[PDB]
Design a protein around this ligand. Sequence first.
Ligand SMILES: [Cl-]
Ligand SMILES: [Cl-]
Length: 162
Amino acid sequence: MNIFEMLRIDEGLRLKIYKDTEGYYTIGIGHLLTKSPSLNAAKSELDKAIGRNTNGVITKDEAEKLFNQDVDAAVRGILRNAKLKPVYDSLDAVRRAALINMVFQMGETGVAGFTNFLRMLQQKRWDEAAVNLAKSRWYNQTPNRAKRVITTFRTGTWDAYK
Ligand SMILES: [Cl-]
Ligand SMILES: [Cl-]
């Protein structure tokens, strides 16, 4: 199990423009296209993204290309972020993957804001940090995914994903 496989479980795969859980235009494996309500604003973002007239539809390869880029960016986002990088540096491999997951879903800014949690992870206080994460709008909004990431942080195992 790795970050690729983990995220692929969490977000799924769709080759046609879809609405995320918040109501946003997304495609592929969790790639957000626009927060704008307009489906045309969605297809134009998507053509830009792919380098071709897609008409709202992409291939598997294309989906995978967007995905690689996005995991890449998430990683480099964490490493550039002054608040996240020290946390990331202090974590074991499994937990690193858990942080990448959260960064990919909610952005660097968002994660950077869970001040108390980042402080608990850094101090290796696992049970505590998991309890804090759960007091979040994120948890409340996508509980099953949230639980899986939470478990990953609590345990240090991929147990929630076998
Ligand atoms: Cl893009
Ligand atoms: Cl979920």
